[PDB]
């Protein structure tokens with residue numbers, strides 16, 4: 001709960017264990033809860049869960065291996081991310097907008113997403129410089145993302161849409177912003193300062209961001225979909 005000072009095997013182990021435990025817990029819960037989800041969301045959870053599940057597992061493995069030695073094939077994480085971004089988004093918006101027809105959000109996410117990956121890939125290729133400025137490029141892209149998103153055609157479909165769709169959308173944007181905004185928040189804590197520049201904090205923070213950007217994604221989407229659809233309190 002705060003600090004930032006652990007040996008290699010120390011931090012590596014703590015995170016590794018936390019990831020394994022969390023991953024499993026989220027897997028068993030999300031799996032068993034697969035039957036405790038809204039009916040109309042049957043396909044929503046199928047496409048969203050399939051893409052989110054494959055990306056999470058893949059990315060997770062890649063990340064772990066990357067920090068394991070220090071060098072790994074980014075081509076996998078790049079293509080996976082670029083293949084999961086438009087997939088998870090398009091699908092999610094597909095079934096979500098399916099209530100009326102289709103969601104144009106795919107276009108917005110396509111442009112923004114492409115740009116983000118472009119910078120991360122181009123700069124990441126050398127990793128010489130981009131962590132510091134990452135706050136700028138990211139901030140701008142983030143603001144613009146929600147800026148136009150806030151006016152999405154979602155509610156434009158009919159007028160005020162349904163309470164379920166509005167709940168899932170609002171919660172989705174909220175998490176996306178928080179998480180995406182947290183990435184740079186923690187990274188900076190280990191980018192310039194930390195303890196001389198330990199790769200540990202880098203891997204951990206990275207895995208944490210991708211973990212919540214994948215796990216939490218389905219956790220919230222499902223929680224809001226199940227809570228809105230028809231469910232009672234109890235945790």
Ligand SMILES: *C/C=C(C)/C=C/C=C(C)/C=C/C1=C(C)CCCC1(C)C
Nearest residue numbers: 116120134135137138180210213214
């Ligand atoms: C499954 C993995 C996910 C959803 C990855 C999300 C990644 C980002 C939101 C990347 C953000 C970045 C910044 C906000 C600043 C510039 C550098 C980035 C692209 C690495």
